[PDB]
Design a protein around this ligand. Structure first.
Ligand code: SF4
Ligand SMILES: [Mg+2]
Ligand SMILES: [Mg+2]
Ligand SMILES: [Mg+2]
Ligand SMILES: [Mg+2]
Ligand SMILES: [Mg+2]
Ligand SMILES: [Mg+2]
Ligand SMILES: [Mg+2]
Ligand SMILES: [Mg+2]
Ligand SMILES: [Mg+2]
Ligand SMILES: [Mg+2]
Ligand SMILES: [Mg+2]
Ligand SMILES: [Mg+2]
Ligand SMILES: [Mg+2]
Ligand SMILES: [Mg+2]
Ligand SMILES: [Mg+2]
Ligand SMILES: [Mg+2]
Ligand SMILES: [Mg+2]
Ligand SMILES: [Mg+2]
Ligand SMILES: [Mg+2]
Ligand SMILES: [Mg+2]
Ligand SMILES: [Mg+2]
Ligand SMILES: [Mg+2]
Ligand SMILES: [Mg+2]
Ligand SMILES: [Mg+2]
Ligand SMILES: [Mg+2]
Ligand SMILES: [Mg+2]
Ligand SMILES: [Mg+2]
Ligand SMILES: [Mg+2]
Ligand SMILES: [Mg+2]
Ligand SMILES: [Mg+2]
Ligand SMILES: [Mg+2]
Ligand SMILES: [Mg+2]
Ligand SMILES: [Mg+2]
Ligand SMILES: [Mg+2]
Ligand SMILES: [Mg+2]
Ligand SMILES: [Mg+2]
Ligand SMILES: [Mg+2]
Ligand SMILES: [Mg+2]
Ligand SMILES: [Mg+2]
Ligand SMILES: [Mg+2]
Ligand SMILES: [Mg+2]
Ligand SMILES: [Mg+2]
Ligand SMILES: [Mg+2]
Ligand SMILES: [Mg+2]
Ligand SMILES: [Mg+2]
Ligand SMILES: [Mg+2]
Ligand SMILES: [Mg+2]
Ligand SMILES: [Mg+2]
Ligand SMILES: [Mg+2]
Ligand SMILES: [Mg+2]
Ligand SMILES: [Mg+2]
Ligand SMILES: [Mg+2]
Ligand SMILES: [Mg+2]
Ligand SMILES: [Mg+2]
Ligand SMILES: [Mg+2]
Ligand SMILES: [Mg+2]
Ligand SMILES: [Mg+2]
Ligand SMILES: [Mg+2]
Ligand SMILES: [Mg+2]
Ligand SMILES: [Mg+2]
Ligand SMILES: [Mg+2]
Ligand SMILES: [Mg+2]
Ligand SMILES: [Mg+2]
Ligand SMILES: [Mg+2]
Ligand SMILES: [Mg+2]
Ligand SMILES: [Mg+2]
Ligand SMILES: [Mg+2]
Ligand SMILES: [Mg+2]
Ligand SMILES: [Mg+2]
Ligand SMILES: [Mg+2]
Ligand SMILES: [Mg+2]
Ligand SMILES: [Mg+2]
Ligand SMILES: [Mg+2]
Ligand SMILES: [Mg+2]
Ligand SMILES: [Mg+2]
Ligand SMILES: [Mg+2]
Ligand SMILES: [Mg+2]
Ligand SMILES: [Mg+2]
Ligand SMILES: [Mg+2]
Ligand SMILES: [Mg+2]
Ligand SMILES: [Mg+2]
Ligand SMILES: [Mg+2]
Ligand SMILES: [Mg+2]
Ligand SMILES: [Mg+2]
Ligand SMILES: [Mg+2]
Ligand SMILES: [Mg+2]
Ligand SMILES: [Mg+2]
Ligand SMILES: [Mg+2]
Ligand SMILES: [Mg+2]
Ligand SMILES: [Mg+2]
Ligand SMILES: [Mg+2]
Ligand SMILES: [Mg+2]
Ligand SMILES: [Mg+2]
Ligand SMILES: [Mg+2]
Ligand SMILES: [Mg+2]
Ligand SMILES: [Mg+2]
Ligand SMILES: [Mg+2]
Ligand SMILES: [Mg+2]
Ligand SMILES: [Mg+2]
Ligand SMILES: [Mg+2]
Ligand SMILES: [Mg+2]
Ligand SMILES: [Mg+2]
Ligand SMILES: [Mg+2]
Ligand SMILES: [Mg+2]
Ligand SMILES: [Mg+2]
Ligand SMILES: [Mg+2]
Ligand SMILES: [Mg+2]
Ligand SMILES: [Mg+2]
Ligand SMILES: [Mg+2]
Ligand SMILES: [Mg+2]
Ligand SMILES: [Mg+2]
Ligand SMILES: [Mg+2]
Ligand SMILES: [Mg+2]
Ligand SMILES: [Mg+2]
Ligand SMILES: [Mg+2]
Ligand SMILES: [Mg+2]
Ligand SMILES: [Mg+2]
Ligand SMILES: [Mg+2]
Ligand SMILES: [Mg+2]
Ligand SMILES: [Mg+2]
Ligand SMILES: [Mg+2]
Ligand SMILES: [Mg+2]
Ligand SMILES: [Mg+2]
Ligand SMILES: [Mg+2]
Ligand SMILES: [Mg+2]
Ligand SMILES: [Mg+2]
Ligand SMILES: [Mg+2]
Ligand SMILES: [Mg+2]
Ligand SMILES: [Mg+2]
Ligand SMILES: [Mg+2]
Ligand SMILES: [Mg+2]
Ligand SMILES: [Mg+2]
Ligand SMILES: [Mg+2]
Ligand SMILES: [Mg+2]
Ligand SMILES: [Mg+2]
Ligand SMILES: [Mg+2]
Ligand SMILES: [Mg+2]
Ligand SMILES: [Mg+2]
Ligand SMILES: [Mg+2]
Ligand SMILES: [Mg+2]
Ligand SMILES: [Mg+2]
Ligand SMILES: [Mg+2]
Ligand SMILES: [Mg+2]
Ligand SMILES: [Mg+2]
Ligand SMILES: [Mg+2]
Ligand SMILES: [Mg+2]
Ligand SMILES: [Mg+2]
Ligand SMILES: [Mg+2]
Ligand SMILES: [Mg+2]
Ligand SMILES: [Mg+2]
Ligand SMILES: [Mg+2]
Ligand SMILES: [Mg+2]
Ligand SMILES: [Mg+2]
Ligand SMILES: [Mg+2]
Ligand SMILES: [Mg+2]
Ligand SMILES: [Mg+2]
Ligand SMILES: [Mg+2]
Ligand SMILES: [Mg+2]
Ligand SMILES: [Mg+2]
Lengths: 99, 96, 208, 7, 82
RNA sequence: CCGAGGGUAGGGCCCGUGACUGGGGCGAAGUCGUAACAAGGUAGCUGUACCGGAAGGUGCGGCUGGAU
RNA sequence: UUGGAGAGUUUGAUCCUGGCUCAGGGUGAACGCUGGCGGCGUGCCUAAGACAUGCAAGUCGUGCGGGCCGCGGGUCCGUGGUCAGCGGCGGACGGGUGAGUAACGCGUGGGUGACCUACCCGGAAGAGGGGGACAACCCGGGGAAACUCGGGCUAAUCCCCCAUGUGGACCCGCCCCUUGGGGUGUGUCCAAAGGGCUUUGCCCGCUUCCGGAUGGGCCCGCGUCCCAUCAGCUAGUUGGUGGGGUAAUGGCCCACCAAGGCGACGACGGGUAGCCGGUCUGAGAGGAUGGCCGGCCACAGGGGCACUGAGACACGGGCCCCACUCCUACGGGAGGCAGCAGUUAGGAAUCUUCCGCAAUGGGCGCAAGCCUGACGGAGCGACGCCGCUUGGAGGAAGAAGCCCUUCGGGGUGUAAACUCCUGAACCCGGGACGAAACCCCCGACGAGGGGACUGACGGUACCGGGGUAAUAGCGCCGGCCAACUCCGUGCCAGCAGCCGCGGUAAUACGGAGGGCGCGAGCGUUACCCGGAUUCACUGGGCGUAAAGGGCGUGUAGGCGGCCUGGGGCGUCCCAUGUGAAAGACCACGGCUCAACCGUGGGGGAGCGUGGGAUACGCUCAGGCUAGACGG
């Protein structure tokens, strides 16, 4: 089955493309604790109907471009800009990490 | 110091020229037909376009073109002719 | 190969009478009943308290020199018993007894395993009808160990089979003196054999 | 490596 | 073509083959597609040959080609019995 | 048109080596003094600063892991 | 529940902490001393340095035309070969290597409505008429050669047009589906090749199409080393549109437009490394490793490139550049051992310029057969594992020699001698399994019958008969650690893994006697895991032993009170697919055993799917006041 993921939209700034931020949980193989890990997927939005804060599902599909390998499958939630802020604050904290 | 590789090399050249000549014509008549399709010149375009189509599939008989290559090249040829003639007049003859 | 050297010094070191010769083991010529102290210049000095390692080594050399088997074969057998199911002490003993050259001795065909080996080694033995000249052959239940037909008539085997008309043989074994045959009945239990050897002390030697 | 060089 | 042939296992001077289906371009003792039986040419055991026969006919039906000395061990196992 | 690479020019990283120079470690029985361990004969240690053949000394503040 | 040992060394002594060290197992090993046999394994880890010579890929005369040669005659055919040429198919397999690569490369599970597949199998349809070229050959220059140029003849399953259209391909319609999937209608386009017999028919081939099967390509999830003393990286960069390209998706490629893409969950950079099944160790968790065998990837002197083609950007094919070497008649040309042997260089170190296609397997062929350094075997090497020998029984209160002594004696020691028994090697004789198919025969070139030829290993194994008592070495003996005395030496010469020994009575140096341990081996060096609970998940710590940040504030993050309900993500359960073989494990069996090898059994974890459970953790919703904040 084509893999189906769920994540928010952290970028709408491309033509016919949105960035979907999927996260997953798993126990540490050695230290057992359940840890979080996230990953951005460049998803296909050909109708340009999806926007920031939208929690959506993406489906594995044939390549639209380089790097673009998933299609947005369906909306799930909307207006989750609270998650988008978490992403942006982190990327923002990187300026305080240089030298 | 020898082989029938020498022979298989001689043959590769003969088929190289045989393949190149066919693809040359396929490119020539296709542009020729597309050029008329832009002018349209509707009848003359389609009359050429058939000779293109005929030579294309005639290549997929041997090792010159793969079936899906001929199909792909035919698909884009007729696809381009119609949209050019739609900026002009009736197709008159055939191939559509 | 095998030890092949002076054998009464073995008994004098181990502090116990090992029956490695033959008739001489029962005579008053037995070195053990004559000088029951270790060989060499210091054998008559007063033994100092041995260590725990010494005690376990001494048990192992005891059991091993009984069978005249090299340390390689001795431990490969030990390790086989370690893997197999059950109590490792008994199984290691059973597999030691299952050696053909030990059976040929345990059946009285020869008066010493060292002589039973040469019997097997020169082919004078068969198993289930087939000649078998391998002292290490693991005998299974039901195998019929017999003297070679071409070798039935030989002074050493007769004199040995003669003096065997007297003795009895272990519960796990069987013997027909007139036909020079013999049968391995079962795998010996621990109590079916009383060696002067605490097999646990041989286990503990390798657990180090 | 022209032509003379600097190094 | 897909074939049905003998992939020699065993040891030196101790031949033991597996009648097996594999690609003809695969190496002799290489990754086969399915095992359809074994064969001891030296006849050192009561059953030195064995064929599934049901499977040996499936691959046969779909276009597998036996070897010349594999065709025999399927004949001798009655794969061809009409 | 692209193109192996060759060439010109200028950067970055790494390795080897260099007159000489800096301390470091180690080395049975060298030279100088005696700073520390006892209130070690000026309680010691300390951050800093300055000085002195050398340990060290002194100032400012801190600590007791300071005797009585 | 098959599984867990520890010791030496800091002190006058003690407890603790803590490092160092040792006993174990392991190796593609090497080095020393030593060395008898057999089996199965195994053997350039360094210079992916450089290579002399042979060989490692060819085959088909049942596709075609010839030159030569013998065979039956009329220089006419047929024929057998033989040699190149044309034309098929193969050369993309198999074999080597580990340089590169930290990557969708590999592993594991998936996607392809985005795709391909020669020879094979199954079903459907068809093979009808014309024409043409180029080698071989004939003629002419050039050359030491490699060798090639020119002109002219000719056949074919070689090339091309026309016809036929089951079908298939394309554009545009409508239908079902739903990413380019399956239909249908008009227009348009595409097929072929013949040969051999036994001839109103078979056989090998050809052609378009559908399906299967097998082998692939492409894509995605998760996993995959060290350095943050590498912290910012990016212009085809990230997306879009159009187009090119391909079997096919894609910035893979180009034009243009947009300004995006990535990064502390480690981007970028640097270093190292082929990955896996597995292998080694370990109580396990883990650690270390990836040679041999199997799977995948990558490369073929260093690079770039495409051609031919089902498939290569092709190890023993082609083009070009570079470095190197070579022959030369000095004008000019050749080469690519990381194939099998072999040479040289490097190194501590790593093999025969062996035999054979008999077997398995592969290419070609109607078949006979040909080719096959794949492979099957032989050779060298204690490299490793396993099996075997250098004898067995007897034999004195106990020889000689040498060692110790209290001078009485003690030891080596039943050890030897000696007696008898056996009989490694060697000698003779017989002598294999691996090998029954292809083929021919009858039937029907089938099912099924019956028949014949073939073995490198090898006159080997093994069997039978005879037959000689027939190599033993190496380490160690202060404690750890099993084994002690004498002499020599006198902080010397030397030993040493750690603690330590040697200064004139050394169980610690050197020899000797004796003793311990292993045994065709025994030791040493190197390296891996273990002991090391000393990177501590299992399973550690931080007042004074090494270890709390000088102190706040706070970002990300980690964690989070009582009650009720929704979902079901974590988590738990059941079913189901995958988890190749080998290996490991248990059982049985085959080489006389064993190693080795064959047969069968037992499975997990992880991931795909389907079903279920909802306490806990998570999320959503609603309420509370014990935490917290406020008046
Ligand atoms: S038993 Fe007496 S004689 Fe036989 S060996 Fe032991 S000591 Fe020597
Ligand atoms: Mg042109
Ligand atoms: Mg084609
Ligand atoms: Mg073993
Ligand atoms: Mg005899
Ligand atoms: Mg152990
Ligand atoms: Mg052999
Ligand atoms: Mg393959
Ligand atoms: Mg340029
Ligand atoms: Mg360039
Ligand atoms: Mg350049
Ligand atoms: Mg150049
Ligand atoms: Mg520079
Ligand atoms: Mg200096
Ligand atoms: Mg002086
Ligand atoms: Mg003082
Ligand atoms: Mg003073
Ligand atoms: Mg003072
Ligand atoms: Mg002072
Ligand atoms: Mg001060
Ligand atoms: Mg002063
Ligand atoms: Mg002060
Ligand atoms: Mg203060
Ligand atoms: Mg005070
Ligand atoms: Mg231990
Ligand atoms: Mg201790
Ligand atoms: Mg000390
Ligand atoms: Mg101290
Ligand atoms: Mg001391
Ligand atoms: Mg004290
Ligand atoms: Mg004292
Ligand atoms: Mg202590
Ligand atoms: Mg410690
Ligand atoms: Mg300690
Ligand atoms: Mg070790
Ligand atoms: Mg050696
Ligand atoms: Mg072998
Ligand atoms: Mg060998
Ligand atoms: Mg080399
Ligand atoms: Mg290695
Ligand atoms: Mg190498
Ligand atoms: Mg070099
Ligand atoms: Mg060189
Ligand atoms: Mg040859
Ligand atoms: Mg032809
Ligand atoms: Mg020919
Ligand atoms: Mg290969
Ligand atoms: Mg090989
Ligand atoms: Mg090799
Ligand atoms: Mg290999
Ligand atoms: Mg590599
Ligand atoms: Mg890297
Ligand atoms: Mg990196
Ligand atoms: Mg990856
Ligand atoms: Mg994957
Ligand atoms: Mg995969
Ligand atoms: Mg082909
Ligand atoms: Mg065929
Ligand atoms: Mg003609
Ligand atoms: Mg003509
Ligand atoms: Mg010509
Ligand atoms: Mg010339
Ligand atoms: Mg000429
Ligand atoms: Mg011409
Ligand atoms: Mg219609
Ligand atoms: Mg036509
Ligand atoms: Mg035709
Ligand atoms: Mg991919
Ligand atoms: Mg990854
Ligand atoms: Mg596009
Ligand atoms: Mg790009
Ligand atoms: Mg552009
Ligand atoms: Mg722009
Ligand atoms: Mg991440
Ligand atoms: Mg590198
Ligand atoms: Mg390497
Ligand atoms: Mg590498
Ligand atoms: Mg452990
Ligand atoms: Mg284990
Ligand atoms: Mg690894
Ligand atoms: Mg490998
Ligand atoms: Mg090999
Ligand atoms: Mg491999
Ligand atoms: Mg390359
Ligand atoms: Mg090379
Ligand atoms: Mg090259
Ligand atoms: Mg190259
Ligand atoms: Mg082609
Ligand atoms: Mg390649
Ligand atoms: Mg090739
Ligand atoms: Mg090439
Ligand atoms: Mg080569
Ligand atoms: Mg050329
Ligand atoms: Mg000349
Ligand atoms: Mg030249
Ligand atoms: Mg020239
Ligand atoms: Mg030239
Ligand atoms: Mg060249
Ligand atoms: Mg070349
Ligand atoms: Mg070679
Ligand atoms: Mg060599
Ligand atoms: Mg050399
Ligand atoms: Mg050298
Ligand atoms: Mg070899
Ligand atoms: Mg063959
Ligand atoms: Mg095969
Ligand atoms: Mg064959
Ligand atoms: Mg064939
Ligand atoms: Mg040849
Ligand atoms: Mg050969
Ligand atoms: Mg071989
Ligand atoms: Mg060697
Ligand atoms: Mg050997
Ligand atoms: Mg004796
Ligand atoms: Mg006496
Ligand atoms: Mg005596
Ligand atoms: Mg004496
Ligand atoms: Mg005496
Ligand atoms: Mg035979
Ligand atoms: Mg054949
Ligand atoms: Mg007939
Ligand atoms: Mg003979
Ligand atoms: Mg004999
Ligand atoms: Mg005899
Ligand atoms: Mg005799
Ligand atoms: Mg003797
Ligand atoms: Mg030792
Ligand atoms: Mg002592
Ligand atoms: Mg030891
Ligand atoms: Mg001791
Ligand atoms: Mg003196
Ligand atoms: Mg001296
Ligand atoms: Mg010493
Ligand atoms: Mg050591
Ligand atoms: Mg003296
Ligand atoms: Mg002395
Ligand atoms: Mg003294
Ligand atoms: Mg001594
Ligand atoms: Mg010592
Ligand atoms: Mg000594
Ligand atoms: Mg051995
Ligand atoms: Mg060794
Ligand atoms: Mg252990
Ligand atoms: Mg550990
Ligand atoms: Mg260690
Ligand atoms: Mg450590
Ligand atoms: Mg540590
Ligand atoms: Mg812990
Ligand atoms: Mg601790
Ligand atoms: Mg504090
Ligand atoms: Mg600070
Ligand atoms: Mg927070
Ligand atoms: Mg939370
Ligand atoms: Mg809670
Ligand atoms: Mg759930
Ligand atoms: Mg498996
Ligand atoms: Mg079991
Ligand atoms: Mg499992
Ligand atoms: Mg599952
Ligand atoms: Mg589900």
């Amino acid at each position: 089955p084509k893999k189906v993921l769920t994540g928010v939209v952290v970028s709408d700034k491309m033509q016919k493309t949105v960035t979907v931020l999927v996260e997953r949980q798993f126990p540490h193989p050695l230290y057992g604790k359940v840890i979080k890990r996230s990953k951005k997927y460049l998803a296909h939005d050909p109708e340009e109907k999806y926007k920031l804060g939208d929690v959506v599902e993406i489906i594995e599909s044939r390549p639209i471009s380089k790097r673009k390998r998933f299609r947005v499958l369906r909306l799930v939630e909307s207006g989750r800009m609270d998650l988008v802020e978490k992403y942006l604050i982190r990327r923002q904290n990187y300026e305080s990490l240089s030298k | 110091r020898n082989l029938s590789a020498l022979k298989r090399h001689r043959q590769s050249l003969k088929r190289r020229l045989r393949n190149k000549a066919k693809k040359s014509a396929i490119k020539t008549l296709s542009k020729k037909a597309i050029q008329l399709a832009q002018e349209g010149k509707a009848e003359e375009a389609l009359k050429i376009m058939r000779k293109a189509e005929s030579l294309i599939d005639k290549a997929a008989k041997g090792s010159t073109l793969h079936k899906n290559a001929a199909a792909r090249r035919k698909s884009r040829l007729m696809r381009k002719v119609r949209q050019l003639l739609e900026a002009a007049g009736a197709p008159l003859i055939g191939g559509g | 190969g095998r030890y092949i050297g002076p054998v009464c010094r073995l008994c004098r070191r181990e502090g116990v009478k090992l029956y490695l010769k033959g008739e001489r083991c029962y005579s008053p010529k037995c070195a053990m009943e004559r000088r029951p102290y270790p060989p060499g210049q210091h054998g008559q000095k007063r033994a100092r308290r041995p260590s725990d390692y010494a005690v376990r080594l001494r048990e192992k050399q005891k059991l091993r020199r009984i069978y005249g088997i090299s340390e390689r074969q001795f431990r490969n057998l030990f390790e086989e018993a370690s893997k197999k199911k059950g109590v490792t002490g008994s199984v290691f003993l059973g597999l030691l007894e299952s050696r053909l050259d030990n059976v040929v001795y345990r059946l009285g065909f020869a008066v010493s395993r060292r002589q039973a080996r040469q019997l097997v080694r020169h082919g004078h033995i068969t198993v289930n009808g087939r000649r078998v000249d391998l002292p290490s052959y693991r005998v299974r239940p039901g195998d019929e160990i017999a003297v070679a037909e071409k070798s039935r008539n030989l002074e050493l085997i007769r004199q040995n089979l003669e003096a065997m008309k007297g003795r009895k043989v272990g519960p796990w074994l069987s013997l027909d003196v007139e036909g020079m045959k013999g049968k391995f009945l079962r795998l010996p239990d621990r109590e079916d054999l009383a060696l002067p050897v605490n097999e646990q002390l041989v286990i503990e030697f390798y657990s180090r | 490596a022209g032509x003379p060089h600097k190094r | 073509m897909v074939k049905i042939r003998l992939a020699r296992f065993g040891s030196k001077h101790n031949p033991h083959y597996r009648i097996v289906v594999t690609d003809a371009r695969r190496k002799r003792d290489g990754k086969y597609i399915e095992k359809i039986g074994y064969y001891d040419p030296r006849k050192t055991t009561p059953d030195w040959l064995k064929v599934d026969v049901e499977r040996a006919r499936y691959w046969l039906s779909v276009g597998a080609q036996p070897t010349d000395t594999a065709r025999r061990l399927l004949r001798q196992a009655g794969v061809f019995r009409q």
